[PDB]
Amino acid sequence: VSLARQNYADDSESAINEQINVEYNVSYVYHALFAYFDRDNIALKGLAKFFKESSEEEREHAEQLIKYQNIRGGRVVLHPITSPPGDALYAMELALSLEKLTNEKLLHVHSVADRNNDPQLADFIESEFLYEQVKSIKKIAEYVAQLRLVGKGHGVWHFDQKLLHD
Amino acid sequence: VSLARQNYADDSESAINEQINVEYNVSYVYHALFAYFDRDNIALKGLAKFFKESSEEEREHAEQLIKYQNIRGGRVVLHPITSPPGDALYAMELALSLEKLTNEKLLHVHSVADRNNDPQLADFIESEFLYEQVKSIKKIAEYVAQLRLVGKGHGVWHFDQKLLHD
Amino acid sequence: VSLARQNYADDSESAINEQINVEYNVSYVYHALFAYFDRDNIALKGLAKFFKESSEEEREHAEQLIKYQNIRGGRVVLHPITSPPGDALYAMELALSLEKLTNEKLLHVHSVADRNNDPQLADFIESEFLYEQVKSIKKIAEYVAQLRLVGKGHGVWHFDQKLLHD
Amino acid sequence: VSLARQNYADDSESAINEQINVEYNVSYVYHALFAYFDRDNIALKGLAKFFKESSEEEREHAEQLIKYQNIRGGRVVLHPITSPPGDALYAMELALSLEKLTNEKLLHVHSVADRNNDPQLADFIESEFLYEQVKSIKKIAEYVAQLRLVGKGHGVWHFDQKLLHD
Numbered sequence: 001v002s003l004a005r006q007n008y009a010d011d012s013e014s015a016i017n018e019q020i021n022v023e024y025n026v027s028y029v030y031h032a033l034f035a036y037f038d039r040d041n042i043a044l045k046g047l048a049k050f051f052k053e054s055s056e057e058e059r060e061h062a063e064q065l066i067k068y069q070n071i072r073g074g075r076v077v078l079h080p081i082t083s084p085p086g087d088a089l090y091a092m093e094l095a096l097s098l099e100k101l102t103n104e105k106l107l108h109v110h111s112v113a114d115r116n117n118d119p120q121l122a123d124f125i126e127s128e129f130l131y132e133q134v135k136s137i138k139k140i141a142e143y144v145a146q147l148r149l150v151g152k153g154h155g156v157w158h159f160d161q162k163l164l165h166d
Numbered sequence: 167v168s169l170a171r172q173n174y175a176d177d178s179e180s181a182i183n184e185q186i187n188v189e190y191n192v193s194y195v196y197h198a199l200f201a202y203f204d205r206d207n208i209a210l211k212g213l214a215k216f217f218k219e220s221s222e223e224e225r226e227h228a229e230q231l232i233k234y235q236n237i238r239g240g241r242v243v244l245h246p247i248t249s250p251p252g253d254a255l256y257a258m259e260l261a262l263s264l265e266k267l268t269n270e271k272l273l274h275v276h277s278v279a280d281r282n283n284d285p286q287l288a289d290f291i292e293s294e295f296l297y298e299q300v301k302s303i304k305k306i307a308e309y310v311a312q313l314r315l316v317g318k319g320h321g322v323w324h325f326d327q328k329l330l331h332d
Numbered sequence: 333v334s335l336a337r338q339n340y341a342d343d344s345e346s347a348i349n350e351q352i353n354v355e356y357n358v359s360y361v362y363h364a365l366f367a368y369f370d371r372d373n374i375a376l377k378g379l380a381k382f383f384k385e386s387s388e389e390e391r392e393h394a395e396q397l398i399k400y401q402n403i404r405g406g407r408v409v410l411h412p413i414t415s416p417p418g419d420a421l422y423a424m425e426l427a428l429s430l431e432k433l434t435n436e437k438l439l440h441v442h443s444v445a446d447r448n449n450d451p452q453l454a455d456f457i458e459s460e461f462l463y464e465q466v467k468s469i470k471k472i473a474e475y476v477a478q479l480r481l482v483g484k485g486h487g488v489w490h491f492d493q494k495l496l497h498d
Numbered sequence: 499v500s501l502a503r504q505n506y507a508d509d510s511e512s513a514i515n516e517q518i519n520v521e522y523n524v525s526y527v528y529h530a531l532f533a534y535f536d537r538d539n540i541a542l543k544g545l546a547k548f549f550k551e552s553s554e555e556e557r558e559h560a561e562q563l564i565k566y567q568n569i570r571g572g573r574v575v576l577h578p579i580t581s582p583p584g585d586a587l588y589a590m591e592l593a594l595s596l597e598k599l600t601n602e603k604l605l606h607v608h609s610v611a612d613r614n615n616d617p618q619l620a621d622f623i624e625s626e627f628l629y630e631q632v633k634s635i636k637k638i639a640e641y642v643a644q645l646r647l648v649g650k651g652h653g654v655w656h657f658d659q660k661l662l663h664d
């Protein structure tokens with residue numbers, strides 16, 4: 001029985017365990033995308049590194065929530081990480097879709113904290129996660145728009161390049 | 167149609183556009199006050215610079231909210247900046263009155279975020295704006311009190327001096 | 333009644349107050365242009381920063397004229413800053429059009445100084461404003477011409493990336 | 499007969515020699531003011547140094563005009579430097595009055611250059627003299643206004659101490 005735990009509903013503990021699983025699954029899709037654009041036939045190394053670094057940071061998010069689960073006196077429960085599936089534009093639109101899905105799950109986590117009168121968890125989600133999440137979505141939204149604008153071929157390669165020196 | 171926008175009510179988008187207008191209008195009053203105490207006949211250069219620097223920072227606040235409007239996938243709408251109108255004490259009491267008006271508008275913006283279940287905007291307003299706003303009000307309240315205490319003439323000039331080397 | 337005022341006609345004082353209003357209004361349009369290209373869907377961050385910094389420097393022009401109004405012993409009068417309205421080519425042509433109307437207003441101010449036998453104000457406008465104005469117009473004219481040359485899509489994005497690191 | 503002289507009217511040469519005389523005379527009054535506030539009984543050393551350095555810079559203005567007379571191929575003609583005459587407020591108002599008569603003489607010199615189609619001399623007066631003159635008048639006007647505000651006694655002494663470390 002936890003020594004630290006206080007004002008920490010089992011709903012909140014459970015929502016954090018679910019969000020941990022979301023971050024792992026998104027980290028896995030980003031590793032898939034890295035694995036794709038790193039192909040010899042694709043050779044978009046800018047997108048490969050951006051997706052590779054995006055995968056480290058989703059896993060760092062999972063670590064932060066494990067660390068937060070234990071700070072609060074909850075217990076971490078791990079679930080299966082499901083396998084994931086112009087290509088550049090499609091991948092960015094996929095990445096945008098995933099950040100918004102992560103955002104949507106984080107808002108639900110926030111709602112669980114609101115409804116359980118857990119204000120430190122609510123401020124944790126809104127300070128350490130919700131603020132980066134909207135910055136990430138806008139950044140990826142701009143990537144989507146820039147890939148639409150450069151068009152296929154030379155412009156995609158140029159935008160990849162670019163990512164690689166950034 | 168916005169790629170980024172998510173859980174961002176048109177009320178919230180509209181409140182940010184209104185707050186942008188409040189910051190511009192307050193920035194304009196501070197430039198008026200700077201323009202006044204910079205007069206040859208007034209020569210209160212400490213208050214002129216303090217009001218001049220206060221004008222840059224209100225405009226920086228407007229920029230932050232434009233930047234935030236676009237981060238959230240909203241669209242910036244700009245409205246007219248209306249013309250503004252012991253002198254030292256009166257100007258500080260005017261400045262205090264304006265910080266409290268800005269504060270009151272920011273709380274309404276916060277309420278719009280509360281009512282629309284937009285927690286990142288609420289934490290943005292309370293973290294990036296509401297905390298400086300109460301620090302600014304207290305600082306200006308102390309200026310008001312110090313100008314009351316020094317009295318007219320020599321004490322006003324001394325307090326201006328003071329501001330100038332601060 | 334001003335202690336400093338000497339050979340400073342009410343026409344000149346009035347012309348400076350109008351040019352103050354012009355610089356604020358141009359500063360406001362540049363902030364509008366900043367707010368537009370900073371959109372998630374537009375994502376031309378090079379133009380957003382160029383318009384944002386152009387906005388900063390028009391406001392600094394307004395401050396210099398306030399500072400000059402008070403140096404000359406005149407009195408600053410502030411008027412309302414009215415709200416402003418390929419997108420990249422169109423915005424640069426709008427910006428070229430604003431620099432030229434700013435220039436045209438500056439020459440009228442210069443004429444007012446010529447007619448009121450105010451050689452210091454005439455040399456101020458010539459030295460501190462008319463020389464930058466003519467350099468700014470050429471720079472923006474060059475940007476117009478480069479955006480026509482690069483064409484839509486990939487070339488616009490490339491030119492924008494140039495601005496962003498320039 | 500001058501090797502350099504070109505488009506340099508005898509009116510312009512004569513106007514420079516008169517302005518040389520004006521700067522020497524203003525330099526002399528400032529040395530008088532220095533000599534007064536340096537008295538043991540007056541002991542306002544901040545005003546004494548400010549008037550002493552003001553005297554140095556009026557003499558440097560005379561040297562620049564000699565240097566300019568010779569640059570233009572004219573011939574310097576020197577005339578007698580006539581002897582000069584709350585004390586602090588009164589002396590600053592006297593100093594404001596001298597900067598403005600110096601300004602008025604400079605504009606007449608500028609007019610002489612305008613009428614003799616001497617644009618280099620006109621731009622010299624505008625650029626090297628009329629711009630500092632207008633800044634000096636404002637500065638001294640501000641000192642007048644601050645000495646009115648601080649009042650007699652302790653405030654005058656305080657303002658003087660400010661000058662001494664400024």
Ligand SMILES: [Mg+2]
Nearest residue numbers: 023058061102
């Ligand atoms: Mg994440």
Ligand SMILES: [Mg+2]
Nearest residue numbers: 057099133136
């Ligand atoms: Mg992310």
Ligand SMILES: [Mg+2]
Nearest residue numbers: 189224227268
């Ligand atoms: Mg503000």
Ligand SMILES: [Mg+2]
Nearest residue numbers: 223265299302
């Ligand atoms: Mg403030």
Ligand SMILES: [Mg+2]
Nearest residue numbers: 341342343448
């Ligand atoms: Mg007239």
Ligand SMILES: [Mg+2]
Nearest residue numbers: 355390393434
């Ligand atoms: Mg300008």
Ligand SMILES: [Mg+2]
Nearest residue numbers: 455458621624
């Ligand atoms: Mg000139």
Ligand SMILES: [Mg+2]
Nearest residue numbers: 390431465468
């Ligand atoms: Mg410009």
Ligand SMILES: [Mg+2]
Nearest residue numbers: 507508509614
């Ligand atoms: Mg003649």
Ligand SMILES: [Mg+2]
Nearest residue numbers: 521556559600
């Ligand atoms: Mg002089």
Ligand SMILES: [Mg+2]
Nearest residue numbers: 556597631634
């Ligand atoms: Mg002088």
